[PDB]
């Protein structure tokens, strides 16, 4: 699969990409000189955990086209952006490795964190690799980088072998953490890449990311191996943590540059944890937004305080007997039967275990749309559109273009299991209904 | 309200008619020289009982047009037919009084009992009023009828007074069973009627109905007053019961011709009873037809015999715990989940009391149409059409023009109380589904 | 003539109605068990006075259809509403008698006084006839009303006689204020009504109108007879006047329930007076609005104060010599000839008596549209549209879509009696002109 990002003379520039699983989107951006297929161990972990894993090949690498232009980070980001906007990804996590970490930063800096929930920096370039006067903490001088460019142009094929030695720490790890076969794979990958790209890539490594680090809006993770020979931890990750103290910081003990493969376990555990905390903060933001819309229709009174208390109770993870809750809702005075049903709907949905209870009569009658064929015809039409959506906001927006009778009917449709949508979309629906009823008062 | 039956020169012939209540249709056909409004006491009883009461004014009477043609029973029936076919009445009961009884017979004879469930003959003309050689049991000779025609033409207004005296037995009943005011009403009614009709009507009274009585296909009721002065019981009802022994026969003791008003109680009790027996035989024919379609999808085996036994049990009126029944259905082996749900649907519907039980999960899932928006879009469309229908056959026929997925979805729609139709229509639906599934096997 | 209000099985529900005279619309709503034709004496008075009299037959009475549903006041009002919206009546007066007074209230309560100028309550049900604990002032207990329903169902025909005795106070008034023949008429009327309606009607009489009385927005009249046997004045009108002190209140001395016929004189005098005061308050609201538009074109000065003073003088009802007035206008300095003519136009129109004066040269020349065929072609077109309008606002709105030359020409057209429109529409025209000239300054 491909996405077109630009043009070169008579050919189009196309980036190879992969899209797997279902759930919260996670974008993995590989390092030099490998491809999206280098993440394989991480991907595998991310799929079993329940995340949407997107991987792609940076221009001039893997199975992407091999142009001879735009080998800089303002372009690489413009690439990534195109990817993000093509797939209309929302609430996404960016994960970059080696070279990938550059995209993350520069993207975040230039284009903003509207779509981005979180970021992760594994074996980072940051802040600024070049050793000058105004950057004393730099890793190497300008002459060292010019030397690598010369080394590749001479013979990239031979160069790879020697690069991968320092990359993986093969004098330590060969036969132990990485197999001879795994190294052979990585070599073929590098070899399949574009000749110009191979030589043009090292020049981008000493890009100045200092003006970009203060833009980093969202929760971040920095990760690095202490035995990293390619990117010295002392000149990158540690000084990167000084510039961004907010970030969560993890040092993996005795790990090389190629810590994705060798130390997959320690990488995954840390990664998933960081994703689990950012996924229980994007679930509590959905839940609390849901709560505000749900409370917008209830009349001010001591009843609104018990209702809110219970919502927060079931939202935080306190297993409450749905049977008692429903029976409590049913018998409430003042509340309109429309209101109780919405609440009813919400609770059954958000309660952790339904315990094998049946659907309530009072809810069914509340959410039936008065038995009007037109409302139900529109509910079916809306339902069709809600299958295609994946976000809360994307669901709520299309839901607001219908009438209050059709929305209720659509809810009841879902309540009655006559259809099925994802949890977040459903919230959008009910919230859209809560806004349509709250705007007529 | 009016129905057009024919044409006279430049004007159309229109019959006044009334349509009240809801349920099994009952047609009331008045006697000479009154209108549909004479039935008022019977109507009142029929509405509280839960029947659809249709009344109309025979040509030349009440508020119907007043032509000078077609004053014979081949026309009066053609009138009635038009009424029946205009309203597309099904499973109807015809009830005739005095002159009305003639229509009933002649209609039944000529046009057949396709639409007719039952008939009733109150104060009947039958079989043949004219006293000749080949009809010795006749009530009066040809000279007696020619004398009435002369009496009306001379002065119909004055004639009515004297007619109503013998009609109601006023020397017995005035101030007692009928009020002076009620008689005054009946007179105004006769007076509002057409002058030609008044004179032309008595000539039809000696119509020969003997060739018509053997055609009477359906269950019948004959009723007459023993003190009937206008139509002697000895020359009508009693000899009518000899020609049709099958009929249910009731003699009201000491009742006049106008026994509708005077003896309303005895008339209603008898009438409703006769309607109640013919309404518990048109409910058992619906139930047993329903049973045959329901059993058409089940695999032959010892399970089909228990299922049938229970259907017959709940169809006959034996209150069976729906909870036990459902739990029995749910746990059955061999039966397809589609089958159980249909059965589930049927039972909840036909069981006398639901006892406040909720809707079953297993049924809901069975009848959801797989959560396919198209099936449900069609179910809504069918549902709309099923609101308009009133019969089992009218429902089943339109249901058979849709797919098996949409029918199931429509059922589930009704099961979930997201809509509502009459009981008989619903049967049509489920039966239509039972035929669509039984034809794919 | 008929208006369709709903549906019963295969027949439409149609209300009989009458529309007579020309002018300000007045709606008369009859009492039980009579029809629109009971108002005859009032109507006659209202036509000679110069009012538009609309009368109709409530469902189940008179010549209206005779269904067996919707016998409640939420339906009776929905009926009345339909009538009002069908005829697009504006600035209407509702007058209800006995049962009619219920419609008035409930209509006013539910649907608002957008169309209604005023109301009148003759022999009122209000506020609440039923005697309970929370209504001690009630007229009778629940058992008394159940007794009437039983009395009718038994024999409505006989019941009417006894009802009309108490209705009219026949032991007092027979041969004196009402004739034996007039009573016979009322009986026939009741007798022609629907049998179900007759019995269903008394159940509506104890409707709770207390929540409806505070809604009564407009000027009201309450009227009742002190010798009223059917509706005791002490339990209705007097306690009704406590709940609505704003109302104008009139007690007719020694009058029965049927005070429409018996005491026609005292009813009419009071009624017309109330209509005359409410027609000189909806004429002063038109007049003062007219005044504001007329004064919008005049230059501020001592001349604007004399002009306004005269307008108010002729608007209040002080007969001023039009000859002197015109001669005063003509000779005024500062005023534009266009302005004088408008004023001229207004005065001749609003002055009570023209005294047989001719049309003024100076006005004719002012309002001729410069003798331009195009302005006059448009004036004719506007004139055509002004014939169809009946309101001030409806007239002014269509007038504002033309040019200032055409409006003047149209005015002159009307001034010259080359056409004719109603008074209020004319005001709209001139006011529309006054706004077109005032917006160019």
Swiss-Prot record, chains A, B, C:
The active site is at 98, 228, 257. It is an enzyme of class 1 (oxidoreductase). Pfam families: Abhydrolase_1. GO terms for biological process: antibiotic biosynthetic process. Keywords: Antibiotic biosynthesis, Oxidoreductase, Peroxidase, Plasmid. It comes from the Bacteria. Homotrimer. Belongs to the AB hydrolase superfamily. Bacterial non-heme haloperoxidase / perhydrolase family. May be a chlorinating enzyme involved in 7-chlorotetracycline biosynthesis. This is Non-haem bromoperoxidase BPO-A2. The gene is bpoA2.
């Amino acid at each position: 699969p491909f996405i077109t990002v630009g043009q070169e003379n008579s050919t189009s520039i196309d980036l190879y990409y992969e899209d797997h699983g279902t759930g919260t989107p996670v974008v993995l951006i590989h390092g030099f000189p490998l491809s999206g297929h280098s993440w394989e161990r991480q991907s595998a972990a991310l799929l079993d955990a329940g995340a949407r894993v997107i991987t792609y090949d940076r221009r001039g690498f893997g199975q992407s086209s091999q142009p001879t232009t735009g080998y800089d980070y303002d372009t690489f980001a413009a690439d990534l952006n195109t990817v993000l906007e093509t797939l209309d990804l929302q609430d996404a996590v960016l994960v970059g490795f080696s070279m990938g970490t550059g995209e993350v930063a520069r993207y975040v800096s230039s284009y903003g964190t509207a779509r981005i929930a979180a970021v992760a920096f594994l074996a980072s370039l940051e802040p600024f690799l070049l050793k000058t006067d105004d950057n004393p903490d730099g890793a190497a001088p300008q002459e060292f980088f010019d030397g690598i460019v010369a080394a590749v142009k001479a013979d990239r094929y031979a160069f790879y072998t020697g690069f991968f030695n320092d990359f993986y720490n093969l004098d330590e790890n060969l036969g132990t953490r990485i197999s001879e076969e795994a190294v052979r794979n990585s070599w073929n990958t590098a070899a399949s890449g574009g000749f110009f790209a191979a030589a043009a890539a090292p020049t981008t490594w000493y890009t100045d990311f200092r003006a970009d680090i203060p833009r980093i809006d969202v929760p971040a993770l920095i990760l690095h191996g202490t035995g990293d020979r390619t990117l010295p931890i002392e000149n990158t990750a540690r000084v990167f943590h000084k510039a961004l103290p907010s970030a969560e910081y993890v040092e993996v003990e005795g790990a090389p540059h190629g810590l994705l493969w060798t130390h997959a376990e320690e990488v995954n555990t840390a990664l998933l944890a960081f994703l689990a905390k950012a996924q229980e903060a994007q679930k509590q933001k959905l839940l609390t937004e849901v709560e505000t819309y749900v409370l917008s229709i209830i009349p001010s009174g001591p009843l609104k305080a018990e209702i809110a208390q219970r919502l927060e109770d079931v939202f935080a993870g306190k297993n409450t007997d749905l049977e008692v809750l429903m029976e409590w809702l049913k018998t409430r005075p003042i509340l309109s039967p429309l209101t109780k049903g919405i609440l009813g709907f919400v609770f059954t949905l958000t309660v952790p275990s339904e315990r094998g209870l049946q659907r309530r009569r009072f809810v069914q009658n509340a959410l039936n749309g008065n038995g009007d064929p037109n409302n139900m015809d529109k509910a079916v039409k809306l339902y069709r559109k809600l299958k295609r959506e994946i976000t809360f906001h994307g669901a709520k927006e299309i839901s607001l273009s219908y009438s209050a009778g059709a929305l209720a009917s659509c809810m009841g449709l879902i309540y009655n299991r006559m259809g099925a949508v994802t949890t977040e979309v459903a919230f959008g629906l009910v919230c859209a209904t809560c806004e349509q009823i709250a705007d007529s008062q």
